[PDB]
Amino acid sequence: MGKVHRPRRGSLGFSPRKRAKSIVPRIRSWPKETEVRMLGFAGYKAGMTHILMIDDEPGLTNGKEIFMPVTIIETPPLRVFGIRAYRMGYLGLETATEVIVPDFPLDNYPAKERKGKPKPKMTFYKLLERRIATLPKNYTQEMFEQKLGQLEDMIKEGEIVDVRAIVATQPWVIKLKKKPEVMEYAIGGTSVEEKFNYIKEKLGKELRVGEVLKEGELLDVIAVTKGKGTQGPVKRWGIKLRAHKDSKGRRKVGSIGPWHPARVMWTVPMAGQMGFHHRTELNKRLIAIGENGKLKLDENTEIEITPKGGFPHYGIVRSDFMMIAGSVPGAIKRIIRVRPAIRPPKKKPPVQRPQITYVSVESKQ
Amino acid sequence: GYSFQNFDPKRMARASARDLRISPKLAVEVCRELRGMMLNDALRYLDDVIALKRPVPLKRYNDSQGHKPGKGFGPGRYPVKVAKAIKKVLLNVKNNAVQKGLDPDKLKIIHIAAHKGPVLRGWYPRAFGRATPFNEQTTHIEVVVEEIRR
Amino acid sequence: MRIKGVVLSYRRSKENQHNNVMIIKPLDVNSREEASKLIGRLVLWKSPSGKILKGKIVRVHGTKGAVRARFEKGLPGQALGDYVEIV
Amino acid sequence: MRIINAEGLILGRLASKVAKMLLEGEEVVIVNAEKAVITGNRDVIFKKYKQRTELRTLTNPRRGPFYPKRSDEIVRRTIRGMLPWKTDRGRKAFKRLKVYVGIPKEFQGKELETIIEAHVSRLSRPKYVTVGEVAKFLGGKF
RNA sequence: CCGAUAGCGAACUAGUACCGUGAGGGAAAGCUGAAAAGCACCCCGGGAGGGGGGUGAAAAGAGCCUGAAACCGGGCGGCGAUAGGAGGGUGCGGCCCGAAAGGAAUGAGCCUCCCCGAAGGAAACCGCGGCGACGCGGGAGUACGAGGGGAGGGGACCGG
RNA sequence: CGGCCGCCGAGACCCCGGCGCACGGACCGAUUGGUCCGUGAUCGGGUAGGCGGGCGUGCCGGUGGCGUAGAAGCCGGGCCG
RNA sequence: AAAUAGGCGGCCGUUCCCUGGCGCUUGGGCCUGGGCGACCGGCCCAUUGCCAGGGACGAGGGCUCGGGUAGAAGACCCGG
């Protein structure tokens, strides 16, 4: 010992480094309620671009041109399958009951020439059929018995706590899956009855980027990061190099530990899973919301996007979209969910609708 | 010899193999797996093993060998040699049983058990002037099949 | 008929057993004084199925109304919990 | 068998009487763990309890003493430590024991009668904490 | 005297196989059956392999008299995927069996009444003390008690 | 901390029956040994070591037996010590 | 796999016959004397239920195939 200190390499604060429990992200932690408005929304990562904006975004100038890298994400429209009710227990929050909607509209769906058998796809949500969640077996009956169950819960009255929504995707242009990913999003207000009224209107409705979320806010992003596979002590934790020239060593930890203690600590660098880990990254600026892409008839607030030739490893973008600042956790083609920020910076104010000087139109290749 | 009860006139048919030059451990996994089936299923099972389709799960001896997908135990491997060899034993019970007045296809396999026989032994080189045993195990496997029908 | 009837341990120091005798609390007995009516009464461990352990009590344990009992055989311990009859 | 309402009753005395009865093979259910009392200077009580939790037995193998943060579990751990959960009888006993959080029961409780050391008079006893307060500070729920 | 891991280096293919440049060094390896009848004939099998039938008797079927232990497969009984460790002793449950060498139908596990009875030894209840915890006298050396005897009922295992 | 009372709690100690040893008494035998009775509260842990009794193995001799209607040997069970 | 071994919504399994023997064995209603009641006794019903002999049906899921946003095997994810 030189009596010199070495600060720890790797964190145990994003540990243990091991595979996600589902491809869907999970959630316990919900951001601030202050409005009767939808919390949390979803997309698929399309690719990346870079953008020129006018500051806005308070920092080292508030008027010169600024480069900001951007993640273009195709969001599907979503369809609220059901209303999930909670009751507060003694030990934690438990789900009282649910209303689902077995009941069937025909889906805004397209596809397919050949032609002789168009073979109708007219979608009762045959995408529910492709979803491996099962269904009664008397559509009308079930919905009503549940609705009555809801009416009870609303009546009692304070037995019932808050309302969250079982919400699922609609793949209606995306070729990377055709089976609803099913999730939970909360519906916040400030008191149960206002959430109960809103969720009930919502259920039959195909909804937008616009409904959920506003431009110029800072947002959290929740996602399962891209899977590397197993990677080394070098990669996972960070390791420094050593003395004059070592053939034998090089990628090595030396000591795992002393002789007594007669054990291995869990904080010493080893190989194992890297990636395919869940991460919430805070405070990403909403550059933009629009729909299409490729052409828009107005010339300010975009003129419309999409590089020609697509993107490497992503299909055609044509549906509602969001362009969010900087890095998004995950791989190309992975489902990401978006979470409003719980609190954003306060030494740096949010400023609504940030000024978008120019958008890229070159391919990533 | 034979290591189980007999009633060969009209309810059992038997055959045995001696000094098959095969792994005894791989005979352990097939005998257990195969045990309790009818002959026809047993043919079908062996034919799949040879194709390299259905795995034979490793169980009692199992160490340091890769897993195999599906229902059945984690590790498993395919003993092609043994499957061919045992197929001949089974074929012999089948031809014999027919002379005996049993119909083979219906008869269930009560008992199949493997015996580690004599050991073919010698030497192959290692370093430092030394020679070490280099051995092939020679195995006997018996099969006694029994009628069951209504 | 029977009055319950609890085997809590053997007479034992923290470190020794004494396998020979067991300590019992009968229910009703508050005191050393009540327990003596139980003296000589036969205690039976019943177990599922039929095998049968008789013993008698033969001595007062308490203080508060415990009684000690001896068996022909002894008790596993497996039952800490037996029954005593009003014979 | 037994429903104890354990409002107003010192933890050690209550936990002994219960631990013994469970070994007899007779169920006790303790209700209202929180409403319970621990006598002594609060600094020390907290410090003692905190310290158990603080480990880091090695640096986390997920073995070694742990202690939980809620008044319920603090108590559930206590009656169990009075029990010999390693042996057959003790183990059987731990299943015989249940703690309930709040009161869910509609039925009346029971008590350990004596006022020597097993029921407080809050004015008479110079120094106490209620067990729920030390649990809130530790991080658990009232 | 020894009796085939013994006795001569060596019961035999021994001073062989083999080692070492050489001088020299140096093992292991015994048993069919009455008769070879040493496996024909018949079925099967690529098959010189292997299985059934064929011998007084094939755990007499070819280093074949007997045929242990370690150990390996299968099967039977028991345990068995929440729980503690010199792997057991001692005591008792569950399951399991036990015809045979043991005692017991001329009565087993078991039930019940009566008496004798070593050391030991109460209570209820009564009267009087002790600040109290509790103690004395009488009940009473009684009830009880290891151990011993007789009778009586039931009807199969009990030890192990 | 200074008193006190009731209990719990050893293989100790008490107590029934048995066993060995030591010693006395008697008897029995062809030798060694054995048996029967009495005494022991003041006999009964145990390494080095000393002594004393029994057991088993191989073969020899005398004597007196067994075996294909099943020896030795092998494996499991029953009984005695 | 938190042994206080969780919560929800949906999906599933959720059986027959002859012949013999039994039924306050199983289940309900009524009257009256006894009971707070369960219960005894009296009255009424069962396509029924039970034992012995033979007997149906099969939700989920993998394996399979084309590829990966996944990956040492195995797993994972998607499409068929």
PDB file of all heavy atoms in Angstrom, chain E residues 40-50:
ATOM      1  P     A E  40     -22.494 -76.803 -33.837  1.00  0.00           P
ATOM      2  OP1   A E  40     -21.223 -76.356 -34.461  1.00  0.00           O
ATOM      3  OP2   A E  40     -23.417 -75.713 -33.297  1.00  0.00           O
ATOM      4  O5'   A E  40     -23.302 -77.799 -34.775  1.00  0.00           O
ATOM      5  C5'   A E  40     -22.691 -78.950 -35.361  1.00  0.00           C
ATOM      6  C4'   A E  40     -23.742 -80.109 -35.570  1.00  0.00           C
ATOM      7  O4'   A E  40     -24.066 -80.598 -34.278  1.00  0.00           O
ATOM      8  C3'   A E  40     -25.087 -79.738 -36.171  1.00  0.00           C
ATOM      9  O3'   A E  40     -24.923 -79.714 -37.651  1.00  0.00           O
ATOM     10  C2'   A E  40     -26.037 -80.796 -35.627  1.00  0.00           C
ATOM     11  O2'   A E  40     -26.083 -82.007 -36.334  1.00  0.00           O
ATOM     12  C1'   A E  40     -25.485 -81.067 -34.286  1.00  0.00           C
ATOM     13  N9    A E  40     -26.109 -80.567 -33.071  1.00  0.00           N
ATOM     14  C8    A E  40     -25.597 -79.688 -32.151  1.00  0.00           C
ATOM     15  N7    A E  40     -26.410 -79.423 -31.162  1.00  0.00           N
ATOM     16  C5    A E  40     -27.536 -80.187 -31.447  1.00  0.00           C
ATOM     17  C6    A E  40     -28.760 -80.366 -30.770  1.00  0.00           C
ATOM     18  N6    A E  40     -29.064 -79.775 -29.609  1.00  0.00           N
ATOM     19  N1    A E  40     -29.670 -81.192 -31.333  1.00  0.00           N
ATOM     20  C2    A E  40     -29.361 -81.797 -32.486  1.00  0.00           C
ATOM     21  N3    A E  40     -28.244 -81.718 -33.208  1.00  0.00           N
ATOM     22  C4    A E  40     -27.364 -80.886 -32.625  1.00  0.00           C
ATOM     23  P     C E  41     -25.868 -78.708 -38.475  1.00  0.00           P
ATOM     24  OP1   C E  41     -25.642 -78.844 -39.932  1.00  0.00           O
ATOM     25  OP2   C E  41     -25.768 -77.379 -37.850  1.00  0.00           O
ATOM     26  O5'   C E  41     -27.333 -79.176 -38.047  1.00  0.00           O
ATOM     27  C5'   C E  41     -28.002 -80.347 -38.559  1.00  0.00           C
ATOM     28  C4'   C E  41     -29.383 -80.428 -37.925  1.00  0.00           C
ATOM     29  O4'   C E  41     -29.249 -80.747 -36.473  1.00  0.00           O
ATOM     30  C3'   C E  41     -30.275 -79.119 -37.908  1.00  0.00           C
ATOM     31  O3'   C E  41     -30.949 -78.947 -39.122  1.00  0.00           O
ATOM     32  C2'   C E  41     -31.217 -79.491 -36.680  1.00  0.00           C
ATOM     33  O2'   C E  41     -32.153 -80.435 -37.077  1.00  0.00           O
ATOM     34  C1'   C E  41     -30.330 -80.052 -35.767  1.00  0.00           C
ATOM     35  N1    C E  41     -29.716 -79.169 -34.773  1.00  0.00           N
ATOM     36  C2    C E  41     -30.398 -78.958 -33.617  1.00  0.00           C
ATOM     37  O2    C E  41     -31.464 -79.590 -33.445  1.00  0.00           O
ATOM     38  N3    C E  41     -29.912 -78.083 -32.699  1.00  0.00           N
ATOM     39  C4    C E  41     -28.748 -77.452 -32.928  1.00  0.00           C
ATOM     40  N4    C E  41     -28.302 -76.610 -31.972  1.00  0.00           N
ATOM     41  C5    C E  41     -28.010 -77.660 -34.125  1.00  0.00           C
ATOM     42  C6    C E  41     -28.515 -78.538 -35.011  1.00  0.00           C
ATOM     43  P     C E  42     -31.405 -77.474 -39.611  1.00  0.00           P
ATOM     44  OP1   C E  42     -31.993 -77.502 -40.975  1.00  0.00           O
ATOM     45  OP2   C E  42     -30.220 -76.565 -39.470  1.00  0.00           O
ATOM     46  O5'   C E  42     -32.526 -76.994 -38.566  1.00  0.00           O
ATOM     47  C5'   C E  42     -33.869 -77.496 -38.419  1.00  0.00           C
ATOM     48  C4'   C E  42     -34.670 -76.679 -37.496  1.00  0.00           C
ATOM     49  O4'   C E  42     -34.157 -76.893 -36.177  1.00  0.00           O
ATOM     50  C3'   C E  42     -34.500 -75.165 -37.769  1.00  0.00           C
ATOM     51  O3'   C E  42     -35.385 -74.763 -38.833  1.00  0.00           O
ATOM     52  C2'   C E  42     -34.947 -74.628 -36.430  1.00  0.00           C
ATOM     53  O2'   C E  42     -36.331 -74.744 -36.273  1.00  0.00           O
ATOM     54  C1'   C E  42     -34.284 -75.686 -35.499  1.00  0.00           C
ATOM     55  N1    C E  42     -33.029 -75.177 -34.942  1.00  0.00           N
ATOM     56  C2    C E  42     -33.113 -74.354 -33.863  1.00  0.00           C
ATOM     57  O2    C E  42     -34.244 -74.151 -33.371  1.00  0.00           O
ATOM     58  N3    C E  42     -31.985 -73.790 -33.359  1.00  0.00           N
ATOM     59  C4    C E  42     -30.793 -74.066 -33.913  1.00  0.00           C
ATOM     60  N4    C E  42     -29.704 -73.493 -33.359  1.00  0.00           N
ATOM     61  C5    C E  42     -30.675 -74.928 -35.037  1.00  0.00           C
ATOM     62  C6    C E  42     -31.811 -75.477 -35.509  1.00  0.00           C
ATOM     63  P     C E  43     -34.991 -73.384 -39.415  1.00  0.00           P
ATOM     64  OP1   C E  43     -35.933 -73.056 -40.507  1.00  0.00           O
ATOM     65  OP2   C E  43     -33.561 -73.277 -39.743  1.00  0.00           O
ATOM     66  O5'   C E  43     -35.402 -72.385 -38.279  1.00  0.00           O
ATOM     67  C5'   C E  43     -36.747 -72.058 -37.913  1.00  0.00           C
ATOM     68  C4'   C E  43     -36.825 -70.952 -36.892  1.00  0.00           C
ATOM     69  O4'   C E  43     -36.162 -71.447 -35.695  1.00  0.00           O
ATOM     70  C3'   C E  43     -36.045 -69.663 -37.153  1.00  0.00           C
ATOM     71  O3'   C E  43     -36.842 -68.858 -38.039  1.00  0.00           O
ATOM     72  C2'   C E  43     -36.031 -69.095 -35.731  1.00  0.00           C
ATOM     73  O2'   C E  43     -37.359 -68.691 -35.396  1.00  0.00           O
ATOM     74  C1'   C E  43     -35.697 -70.285 -34.940  1.00  0.00           C
ATOM     75  N1    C E  43     -34.256 -70.327 -34.682  1.00  0.00           N
ATOM     76  C2    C E  43     -33.785 -69.586 -33.645  1.00  0.00           C
ATOM     77  O2    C E  43     -34.618 -68.983 -32.933  1.00  0.00           O
ATOM     78  N3    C E  43     -32.447 -69.526 -33.413  1.00  0.00           N
ATOM     79  C4    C E  43     -31.603 -70.217 -34.196  1.00  0.00           C
ATOM     80  N4    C E  43     -30.286 -70.136 -33.908  1.00  0.00           N
ATOM     81  C5    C E  43     -32.068 -71.006 -35.283  1.00  0.00           C
ATOM     82  C6    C E  43     -33.398 -71.050 -35.481  1.00  0.00           C
ATOM     83  P     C E  44     -36.032 -67.920 -39.007  1.00  0.00           P
ATOM     84  OP1   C E  44     -37.008 -67.164 -39.907  1.00  0.00           O
ATOM     85  OP2   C E  44     -35.049 -68.820 -39.650  1.00  0.00           O
ATOM     86  O5'   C E  44     -35.287 -66.779 -38.072  1.00  0.00           O
ATOM     87  C5'   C E  44     -36.139 -65.912 -37.261  1.00  0.00           C
ATOM     88  C4'   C E  44     -35.292 -65.045 -36.362  1.00  0.00           C
ATOM     89  O4'   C E  44     -34.550 -65.860 -35.496  1.00  0.00           O
ATOM     90  C3'   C E  44     -34.137 -64.153 -37.041  1.00  0.00           C
ATOM     91  O3'   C E  44     -34.722 -62.938 -37.518  1.00  0.00           O
ATOM     92  C2'   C E  44     -33.305 -63.970 -35.835  1.00  0.00           C
ATOM     93  O2'   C E  44     -33.764 -62.941 -34.989  1.00  0.00           O
ATOM     94  C1'   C E  44     -33.271 -65.293 -35.166  1.00  0.00           C
ATOM     95  N1    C E  44     -32.104 -66.135 -35.440  1.00  0.00           N
ATOM     96  C2    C E  44     -30.972 -65.883 -34.733  1.00  0.00           C
ATOM     97  O2    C E  44     -31.023 -65.005 -33.842  1.00  0.00           O
ATOM     98  N3    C E  44     -29.838 -66.581 -35.005  1.00  0.00           N
ATOM     99  C4    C E  44     -29.851 -67.529 -35.956  1.00  0.00           C
ATOM    100  N4    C E  44     -28.702 -68.205 -36.172  1.00  0.00           N
ATOM    101  C5    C E  44     -31.023 -67.819 -36.705  1.00  0.00           C
ATOM    102  C6    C E  44     -32.131 -67.116 -36.405  1.00  0.00           C
ATOM    103  P     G E  45     -34.194 -62.153 -38.793  1.00  0.00           P
ATOM    104  OP1   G E  45     -34.962 -60.883 -38.888  1.00  0.00           O
ATOM    105  OP2   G E  45     -34.084 -62.999 -40.030  1.00  0.00           O
ATOM    106  O5'   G E  45     -32.801 -61.763 -38.290  1.00  0.00           O
ATOM    107  C5'   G E  45     -32.656 -60.752 -37.215  1.00  0.00           C
ATOM    108  C4'   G E  45     -31.183 -60.594 -36.708  1.00  0.00           C
ATOM    109  O4'   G E  45     -30.702 -61.865 -36.054  1.00  0.00           O
ATOM    110  C3'   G E  45     -30.104 -60.440 -37.774  1.00  0.00           C
ATOM    111  O3'   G E  45     -30.160 -59.080 -38.202  1.00  0.00           O
ATOM    112  C2'   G E  45     -28.791 -60.927 -37.033  1.00  0.00           C
ATOM    113  O2'   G E  45     -28.377 -59.982 -36.025  1.00  0.00           O
ATOM    114  C1'   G E  45     -29.324 -62.102 -36.345  1.00  0.00           C
ATOM    115  N9    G E  45     -29.141 -63.345 -37.083  1.00  0.00           N
ATOM    116  C8    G E  45     -30.030 -63.897 -37.967  1.00  0.00           C
ATOM    117  N7    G E  45     -29.584 -64.984 -38.528  1.00  0.00           N
ATOM    118  C5    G E  45     -28.333 -65.175 -37.959  1.00  0.00           C
ATOM    119  C6    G E  45     -27.362 -66.175 -38.192  1.00  0.00           C
ATOM    120  O6    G E  45     -27.421 -67.152 -38.960  1.00  0.00           O
ATOM    121  N1    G E  45     -26.214 -65.962 -37.435  1.00  0.00           N
ATOM    122  C2    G E  45     -26.023 -64.923 -36.582  1.00  0.00           C
ATOM    123  N2    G E  45     -24.846 -64.879 -35.982  1.00  0.00           N
ATOM    124  N3    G E  45     -26.921 -63.995 -36.339  1.00  0.00           N
ATOM    125  C4    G E  45     -28.044 -64.179 -37.062  1.00  0.00           C
ATOM    126  P     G E  46     -29.045 -58.353 -39.104  1.00  0.00           P
ATOM    127  OP1   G E  46     -27.862 -57.947 -38.310  1.00  0.00           O
ATOM    128  OP2   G E  46     -29.725 -57.266 -39.885  1.00  0.00           O
ATOM    129  O5'   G E  46     -28.567 -59.448 -40.167  1.00  0.00           O
ATOM    130  C5'   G E  46     -28.476 -59.169 -41.532  1.00  0.00           C
ATOM    131  C4'   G E  46     -27.010 -59.065 -42.038  1.00  0.00           C
ATOM    132  O4'   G E  46     -26.461 -57.810 -41.625  1.00  0.00           O
ATOM    133  C3'   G E  46     -26.041 -60.079 -41.438  1.00  0.00           C
ATOM    134  O3'   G E  46     -26.374 -61.377 -42.013  1.00  0.00           O
ATOM    135  C2'   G E  46     -24.726 -59.403 -41.945  1.00  0.00           C
ATOM    136  O2'   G E  46     -24.515 -59.683 -43.274  1.00  0.00           O
ATOM    137  C1'   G E  46     -25.037 -58.122 -41.631  1.00  0.00           C
ATOM    138  N9    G E  46     -24.475 -57.413 -40.489  1.00  0.00           N
ATOM    139  C8    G E  46     -25.167 -56.630 -39.604  1.00  0.00           C
ATOM    140  N7    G E  46     -24.422 -56.163 -38.643  1.00  0.00           N
ATOM    141  C5    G E  46     -23.153 -56.647 -38.926  1.00  0.00           C
ATOM    142  C6    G E  46     -21.935 -56.498 -38.226  1.00  0.00           C
ATOM    143  O6    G E  46     -21.713 -55.857 -37.183  1.00  0.00           O
ATOM    144  N1    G E  46     -20.900 -57.199 -38.839  1.00  0.00           N
ATOM    145  C2    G E  46     -21.024 -57.949 -39.963  1.00  0.00           C
ATOM    146  N2    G E  46     -19.928 -58.567 -40.367  1.00  0.00           N
ATOM    147  N3    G E  46     -22.144 -58.086 -40.638  1.00  0.00           N
ATOM    148  C4    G E  46     -23.163 -57.416 -40.063  1.00  0.00           C
ATOM    149  P     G E  47     -26.600 -62.793 -41.183  1.00  0.00           P
ATOM    150  OP1   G E  47     -26.607 -63.913 -42.127  1.00  0.00           O
ATOM    151  OP2   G E  47     -27.683 -62.697 -40.186  1.00  0.00           O
ATOM    152  O5'   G E  47     -25.231 -62.906 -40.316  1.00  0.00           O
ATOM    153  C5'   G E  47     -23.900 -62.775 -40.935  1.00  0.00           C
ATOM    154  C4'   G E  47     -22.901 -62.193 -39.875  1.00  0.00           C
ATOM    155  O4'   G E  47     -23.383 -61.020 -39.306  1.00  0.00           O
ATOM    156  C3'   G E  47     -22.772 -63.064 -38.666  1.00  0.00           C
ATOM    157  O3'   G E  47     -21.707 -64.000 -38.714  1.00  0.00           O
ATOM    158  C2'   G E  47     -22.702 -62.098 -37.535  1.00  0.00           C
ATOM    159  O2'   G E  47     -21.539 -62.172 -36.727  1.00  0.00           O
ATOM    160  C1'   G E  47     -22.728 -60.756 -38.186  1.00  0.00           C
ATOM    161  N9    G E  47     -23.359 -59.836 -37.249  1.00  0.00           N
ATOM    162  C8    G E  47     -24.703 -59.598 -37.135  1.00  0.00           C
ATOM    163  N7    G E  47     -24.993 -58.769 -36.173  1.00  0.00           N
ATOM    164  C5    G E  47     -23.763 -58.420 -35.637  1.00  0.00           C
ATOM    165  C6    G E  47     -23.441 -57.574 -34.552  1.00  0.00           C
ATOM    166  O6    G E  47     -24.207 -56.910 -33.831  1.00  0.00           O
ATOM    167  N1    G E  47     -22.069 -57.540 -34.316  1.00  0.00           N
ATOM    168  C2    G E  47     -21.138 -58.235 -35.019  1.00  0.00           C
ATOM    169  N2    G E  47     -19.889 -58.097 -34.614  1.00  0.00           N
ATOM    170  N3    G E  47     -21.418 -59.013 -36.042  1.00  0.00           N
ATOM    171  C4    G E  47     -22.742 -59.062 -36.290  1.00  0.00           C
ATOM    172  P     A E  48     -20.235 -63.798 -39.271  1.00  0.00           P
ATOM    173  OP1   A E  48     -19.796 -62.365 -39.217  1.00  0.00           O
ATOM    174  OP2   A E  48     -20.130 -64.525 -40.553  1.00  0.00           O
ATOM    175  O5'   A E  48     -19.405 -64.544 -38.256  1.00  0.00           O
ATOM    176  C5'   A E  48     -19.186 -65.876 -38.179  1.00  0.00           C
ATOM    177  C4'   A E  48     -18.295 -66.165 -36.965  1.00  0.00           C
ATOM    178  O4'   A E  48     -16.965 -65.611 -37.355  1.00  0.00           O
ATOM    179  C3'   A E  48     -18.549 -65.414 -35.664  1.00  0.00           C
ATOM    180  O3'   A E  48     -19.315 -66.135 -34.742  1.00  0.00           O
ATOM    181  C2'   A E  48     -17.152 -65.226 -35.117  1.00  0.00           C
ATOM    182  O2'   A E  48     -16.579 -66.446 -34.594  1.00  0.00           O
ATOM    183  C1'   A E  48     -16.433 -64.700 -36.454  1.00  0.00           C
ATOM    184  N9    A E  48     -16.727 -63.276 -36.510  1.00  0.00           N
ATOM    185  C8    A E  48     -17.017 -62.426 -35.474  1.00  0.00           C
ATOM    186  N7    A E  48     -17.227 -61.189 -35.847  1.00  0.00           N
ATOM    187  C5    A E  48     -17.069 -61.229 -37.227  1.00  0.00           C
ATOM    188  C6    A E  48     -17.180 -60.241 -38.227  1.00  0.00           C
ATOM    189  N6    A E  48     -17.502 -58.965 -37.982  1.00  0.00           N
ATOM    190  N1    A E  48     -16.952 -60.616 -39.505  1.00  0.00           N
ATOM    191  C2    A E  48     -16.645 -61.895 -39.753  1.00  0.00           C
ATOM    192  N3    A E  48     -16.524 -62.915 -38.903  1.00  0.00           N
ATOM    193  C4    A E  48     -16.752 -62.507 -37.644  1.00  0.00           C
ATOM    194  P     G E  49     -20.037 -65.402 -33.507  1.00  0.00           P
ATOM    195  OP1   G E  49     -19.933 -66.190 -32.292  1.00  0.00           O
ATOM    196  OP2   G E  49     -21.452 -65.197 -33.834  1.00  0.00           O
ATOM    197  O5'   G E  49     -19.312 -64.016 -33.373  1.00  0.00           O
ATOM    198  C5'   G E  49     -18.532 -63.665 -32.189  1.00  0.00           C
ATOM    199  C4'   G E  49     -19.083 -62.350 -31.500  1.00  0.00           C
ATOM    200  O4'   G E  49     -19.680 -61.500 -32.512  1.00  0.00           O
ATOM    201  C3'   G E  49     -20.291 -62.716 -30.685  1.00  0.00           C
ATOM    202  O3'   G E  49     -19.864 -63.200 -29.447  1.00  0.00           O
ATOM    203  C2'   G E  49     -21.038 -61.475 -30.612  1.00  0.00           C
ATOM    204  O2'   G E  49     -20.534 -60.590 -29.682  1.00  0.00           O
ATOM    205  C1'   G E  49     -20.908 -60.930 -31.992  1.00  0.00           C
ATOM    206  N9    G E  49     -22.113 -61.230 -32.755  1.00  0.00           N
ATOM    207  C8    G E  49     -22.242 -62.198 -33.712  1.00  0.00           C
ATOM    208  N7    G E  49     -23.450 -62.284 -34.193  1.00  0.00           N
ATOM    209  C5    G E  49     -24.154 -61.291 -33.528  1.00  0.00           C
ATOM    210  C6    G E  49     -25.515 -60.921 -33.610  1.00  0.00           C
ATOM    211  O6    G E  49     -26.408 -61.395 -34.335  1.00  0.00           O
ATOM    212  N1    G E  49     -25.822 -59.892 -32.723  1.00  0.00           N
ATOM    213  C2    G E  49     -24.942 -59.310 -31.869  1.00  0.00           C
ATOM    214  N2    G E  49     -25.438 -58.374 -31.081  1.00  0.00           N
ATOM    215  N3    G E  49     -23.669 -59.630 -31.792  1.00  0.00           N
ATOM    216  C4    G E  49     -23.347 -60.625 -32.641  1.00  0.00           C
ATOM    217  P     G E  50     -20.647 -64.295 -28.636  1.00  0.00           P
ATOM    218  OP1   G E  50     -20.184 -64.402 -27.229  1.00  0.00           O
ATOM    219  OP2   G E  50     -20.686 -65.584 -29.398  1.00  0.00           O
ATOM    220  O5'   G E  50     -22.046 -63.669 -28.606  1.00  0.00           O
ATOM    221  C5'   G E  50     -22.337 -62.728 -27.536  1.00  0.00           C
ATOM    222  C4'   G E  50     -23.801 -62.256 -27.531  1.00  0.00           C
ATOM    223  O4'   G E  50     -24.017 -61.734 -28.864  1.00  0.00           O
ATOM    224  C3'   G E  50     -24.875 -63.248 -27.414  1.00  0.00           C
ATOM    225  O3'   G E  50     -24.999 -63.513 -26.037  1.00  0.00           O
ATOM    226  C2'   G E  50     -26.052 -62.466 -28.039  1.00  0.00           C
ATOM    227  O2'   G E  50     -26.338 -61.371 -27.211  1.00  0.00           O
ATOM    228  C1'   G E  50     -25.328 -61.908 -29.254  1.00  0.00           C
ATOM    229  N9    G E  50     -25.594 -62.874 -30.311  1.00  0.00           N
ATOM    230  C8    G E  50     -24.780 -63.912 -30.678  1.00  0.00           C
ATOM    231  N7    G E  50     -25.293 -64.655 -31.618  1.00  0.00           N
ATOM    232  C5    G E  50     -26.509 -64.053 -31.906  1.00  0.00           C
ATOM    233  C6    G E  50     -27.521 -64.420 -32.821  1.00  0.00           C
ATOM    234  O6    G E  50     -27.540 -65.376 -33.616  1.00  0.00           O
ATOM    235  N1    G E  50     -28.611 -63.556 -32.755  1.00  0.00           N
ATOM    236  C2    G E  50     -28.716 -62.495 -31.916  1.00  0.00           C
ATOM    237  N2    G E  50     -29.850 -61.820 -31.980  1.00  0.00           N
ATOM    238  N3    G E  50     -27.778 -62.128 -31.070  1.00  0.00           N
ATOM    239  C4    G E  50     -26.711 -62.950 -31.116  1.00  0.00           C
TER     240        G E  50
END
